[PDB]
Amino acid sequence: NLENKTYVIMGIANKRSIAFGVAKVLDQLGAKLVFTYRKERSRKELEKLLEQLNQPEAHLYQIDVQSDEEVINGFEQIGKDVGNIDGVYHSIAFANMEDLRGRFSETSREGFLLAQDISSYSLTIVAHEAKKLMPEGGSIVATTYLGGEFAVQNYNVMGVAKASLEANVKYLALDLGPDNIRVNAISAGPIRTLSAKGVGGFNTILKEIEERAPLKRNVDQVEVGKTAAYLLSDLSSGVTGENIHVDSGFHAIK
Amino acid sequence: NLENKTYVIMGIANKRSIAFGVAKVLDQLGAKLVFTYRKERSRKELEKLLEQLNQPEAHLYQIDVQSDEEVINGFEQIGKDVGNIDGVYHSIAFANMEDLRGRFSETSREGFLLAQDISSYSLTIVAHEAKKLMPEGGSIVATTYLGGEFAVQNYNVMGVAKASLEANVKYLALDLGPDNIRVNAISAGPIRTLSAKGVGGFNTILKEIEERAPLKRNVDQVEVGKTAAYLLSDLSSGVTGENIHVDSGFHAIK
Amino acid sequence: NLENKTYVIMGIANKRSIAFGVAKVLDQLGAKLVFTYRKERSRKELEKLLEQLNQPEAHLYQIDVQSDEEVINGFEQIGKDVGNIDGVYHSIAFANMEDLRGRFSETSREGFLLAQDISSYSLTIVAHEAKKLMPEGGSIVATTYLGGEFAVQNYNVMGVAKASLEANVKYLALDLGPDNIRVNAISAGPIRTLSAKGVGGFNTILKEIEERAPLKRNVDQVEVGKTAAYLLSDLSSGVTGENIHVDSGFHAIK
Amino acid sequence: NLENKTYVIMGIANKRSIAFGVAKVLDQLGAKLVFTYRKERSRKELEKLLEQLNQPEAHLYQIDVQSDEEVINGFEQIGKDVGNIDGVYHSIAFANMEDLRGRFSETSREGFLLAQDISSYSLTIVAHEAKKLMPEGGSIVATTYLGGEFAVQNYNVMGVAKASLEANVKYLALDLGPDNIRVNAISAGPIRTLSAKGVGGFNTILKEIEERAPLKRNVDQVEVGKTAAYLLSDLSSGVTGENIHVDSGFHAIK
Ligand SMILES: NC(=O)c1ccc[n+]([C@@H]2O[C@H](COP(=O)([O-])OP(=O)(O)OC[C@H]3O[C@@H](n4cnc5c(N)ncnc54)[C@H](OP(=O)(O)O)[C@@H]3O)[C@@H](O)[C@H]2O)c1
Ligand SMILES: NC(=O)c1ccc[n+]([C@@H]2O[C@H](COP(=O)([O-])OP(=O)(O)OC[C@H]3O[C@@H](n4cnc5c(N)ncnc54)[C@H](OP(=O)(O)O)[C@@H]3O)[C@@H](O)[C@H]2O)c1
Ligand SMILES: NC(=O)c1ccc[n+]([C@@H]2O[C@H](COP(=O)([O-])OP(=O)(O)OC[C@H]3O[C@@H](n4cnc5c(N)ncnc54)[C@H](OP(=O)(O)O)[C@@H]3O)[C@@H](O)[C@H]2O)c1
């Protein structure tokens, strides 16, 4: 039960976004939700998707996590509009498409740093600004993939950006733990989303889960959202620096 | 919300048992609970502890997990008495004082195999018997410690037993996943219980957690119970073969 | 260069044994070698295989690692025959055939404990006895598989015994470190040997390595042997409690 | 024996550099060595240091790894001057001093990306250029630290850069494995070097190893160099995407 909680959900682009499965679950559990987006198209999609939620007010903020001032001012505006928050769900990554197929060793410096900036560093600065709204403690969760732990074909520069994110989670957990802020990751199995369309071989990744993972099926956004509700709530009070795989068991097999 | 769910909880000895933390949480959430014990003194404690619970009926079965027949007959009786179950919490381990409190390289064969048998093999046979009561699926959770992942001073034979149990969890997850049974572990931080008396230097282990773990505090049995509630319920659909550290973040630091 | 070093190699059965790859390499580097075996037939193979090696004398001892007396008396006799040794290569495991295929949840208690006894505990008692012949320090290496780290189809009871071995390696490393004895594992990739005939689906495991592993080829016993020379020698003096995968990179991908 | 092998060693600053331990070992084993340095100081210094080696000639190239041109042109020139190479030792990392103490959550975007660029991406572009000089295969080794696997006090931005670097090794292993180029890391224990002075609390880190690591002592640059010789030679054929801890066993304990 999350009535009287407030969470900031970063990274809804459309009805297939992982962050939207999180939103549906939290919403259904009674939470107040604030949404951040980059592209105008994503705000338009949030406005339509909010008609499916039970949020009596639209709280939408444009935050491009490449910009310190947009992250700083965005959270400062959120604090002014809704007061203190209980957590942040971070569902944000980016890499140029030519870096999500072919040969990893041909990755450009600009593409490698782009992916690090948006997919990893953004959690650091978000945590720094979000903590200002969590004087009593809180919970920050980011979304990762098994390609941060193992080399997977095609995931290439984003695998190295997820390894960076997963370490970023541990270091933030150590730093913010004395402030009663927990920081954790969910390592989601493959899910058809707008960003999946850029990963080479994505359909064969999905098929392999169905054939080989312990549950012999793929997961969906709402399953990620249910684990998010656990990590964002008091149920997980003793848990920080942790990476929970929501992937039908695929992480545990070879 | 666990109304209309039934769970078997194995390994309450007294009010400090981790499994009683689990019981309290599941009870508060509306579950029907069934309890298994070894020593007659454990049954007496269970009888006194059930007064604190909302359980309208006492469902108590003696199962020494060294005996196949006791596990077989105990789960069969549980089925005839309460019907199908939704999961099992396994909170059982044992090792001799004499092997524990000597150099690891001095561990006796008998003591090594005793600790495997009770602390690891018991999950396998329990899973096999409990699956007969879970025709539509279920969840099985066992309780481990960071000593199964790293060599910790003094934990000695029980660290090898915990590594065995953590691998047992992954193999059971692979085997039983197509039956929609999930199998997971909770890696609890140190907690003062009857069995902790067995571990040398236990007080300095507690003190290290306070000084060094991200949350700068120790965890308690109810925190283990809240993560158990997540693992045993539909909130962790899609999570199997996982090991969730309820340990203030200690696993993530060095 | 291992002239003036002496190593005990445990677990040659025939010319395909992983331990015979280790023997050839160590022999080619000038080490003096002592061999232990269980079955008469293995002693006969060792007698034949020694004609290929540069050892000027056969040091052969029957040690069934299920027997404490055989391990104690065998190492005692080794020390009386060749003096102090520089390390031990352990290449011993066993499980009953029915436990290397089908459903893990059906594993018998006696089969689970049998595999633990031979494949894990044996290392502990061997280290205890071998330490008496290494008063200046030494190196002990055991042979594991990725199935001890992940659930692998069919490997079943041996995967849990290997997770146990791997923890045994870390706990021995911690215990024996102050005596200047290093203890490490090599995680070998699949290799056609007599014991491979017990693993269901073995040929499929081999084909997956050629298709998926970074080197796109399988490894052989001599490559294990070369990593064994590294771990048994001063070249690895800083390295203990480690598990080195000699598996064409397969451990690193998913 | 590395006679008739040529290795490029990147990252000698002075007599305490880890890469100078590597050079000593490879030089002694008969390898021809080429050296790269960033700033002038490291030149002058290199010129002097190399009188301690048996290199008949001084092959020194200025390469600042922030510059694509310098990496591309530097490897090109090494190929013209010396011909094909057998491997590359990468011993290069950098972060701003302020980012190696205090609160990780305060790290600037500029500081985080600088550490990623120099300490992780540099391996990718180095590997791409160096491949051109390894048409029959070779071996690339980078130097990492346990702070890339766990959150360590103070190490902060560099911990996230080393996590990135360790994933970089695996993705390069997968990519370059079919060209018979292996890529691996050495995770060195703490060692007093010029870069160590920047790391907050370094002396406390060192003391902890002596007190708690299995070998109860610290490691040195030459021990890193001996494991580098293993990784760079045919002894480690079959080993790729691996991270070998030369740290007195500290990684294996908690
Ligand atoms: N789909 C999967 O199988 C899978 C599996 C594991 C993990 N993940 C992770 O889950 C997360 C969500 O991805 P998704 O699959 O749900 O795809 P998605 O719907 O495309 O979500 C990606 C989000 O990233 C945002 N974003 C990119 N750059 C940004 C920037 N500079 N500033 C602020 N927002 C930015 C996008 O916003 P705009 O569209 O407004 O630009 C979009 O809302 C990502 O971290 C992804 O790596 C996905
Ligand atoms: N305390 C901690 O710091 C800690 C941390 C991580 C993990 N754990 C784990 O948590 C679990 C519970 O331990 P605890 O600390 O709660 O100690 P506990 O209160 O002493 O519970 C241990 C239980 O194991 C049972 N048991 C032992 N052998 C048995 C057998 N042959 N058949 C049936 N039951 C048997 C005992 O039953 P009887 O008394 O009836 O014999 C007792 O109920 C164990 O797996 C333990 O390793 C403990
Ligand atoms: N082949 C692979 O793909 C692979 C991969 C990774 C790891 N491994 C491991 O490598 C090691 C060697 O196996 P292998 O593949 O080389 O097969 P192998 O040639 O069949 O060697 C197995 C050895 O185990 C010995 N052994 C079994 N029980 C024993 C006992 N009670 N006491 C003394 N020795 C006993 C056997 O001796 P007797 O025949 O005399 O009984 C035999 O010499 C094992 O630990 C295995 O798990 C194998």
Ligand SMILES: NC(=O)c1ccc[n+]([C@@H]2O[C@H](COP(=O)([O-])OP(=O)(O)OC[C@H]3O[C@@H](n4cnc5c(N)ncnc54)[C@H](OP(=O)(O)O)[C@@H]3O)[C@@H](O)[C@H]2O)c1
């Ligand atoms: N010492 C330790 O305890 C320890 C432990 C684990 C891992 N490591 C790692 O070992 C490696 C070597 O460090 P070290 O401790 O040997 O210290 P070091 O002697 O200071 O070596 C660091 C080297 O990095 C070079 N470097 C920095 N930025 C560069 C750039 N942009 N282009 C080219 N070179 C650049 C420096 O060259 P200039 O001096 O010319 O600036 C210096 O030679 C690093 O990867 C470090 O993280 C060190």
Ligand SMILES: CCc1cc(O)c(Oc2cccnc2F)cc1F
């Ligand atoms: C293979 C599974 C997967 C993982 C992801 O991280 C993912 O999301 C991204 C992948 C690449 C770039 N930006 C993203 F958001 C999509 C995906 F489909």
Ligand SMILES: CCc1cc(O)c(Oc2cccnc2F)cc1F
């Ligand atoms: C150090 C933390 C800890 C872990 C345990 O597994 C634990 O439980 C046991 C420890 C040893 C033997 N039987 C047990 F049940 C107690 C403990 F105190």
Ligand SMILES: CCc1cc(O)c(Oc2cccnc2F)cc1F
């Ligand atoms: C699949 C790879 C593999 C691993 C082994 O541990 C192995 O060796 C055994 C496998 C099962 C039982 N005893 C053994 F010695 C054979 C093998 F082929």
Ligand SMILES: CCc1cc(O)c(Oc2cccnc2F)cc1F
């Ligand atoms: C704590 C151990 C350690 C690790 C390092 O990576 C290290 O080297 C650097 C540390 C930080 C920045 N640049 C470096 F080269 C020094 C160090 F002393």
Ligand SMILES: N[C@@H](CCC(=O)O)C(=O)O
């Ligand atoms: N190479 C295709 C992969 C097709 C698939 O999803 O399997 C792509 O670039 O998406």
Ligand SMILES: N[C@@H](CCC(=O)O)C(=O)O
């Ligand atoms: N070895 C002591 C432990 C002392 C402590 O708790 O620190 C014991 O017998 O329990």
Ligand SMILES: N[C@@H](CCC(=O)O)C(=O)O
């Ligand atoms: N020689 C193979 C025969 C494979 C087959 O034809 O069954 C064996 O050892 O089983």
Ligand SMILES: N[C@@H](CCC(=O)O)C(=O)O
């Ligand atoms: N079921 C066969 C598998 C055939 C193979 O792939 O080796 C076995 O038991 O060996």
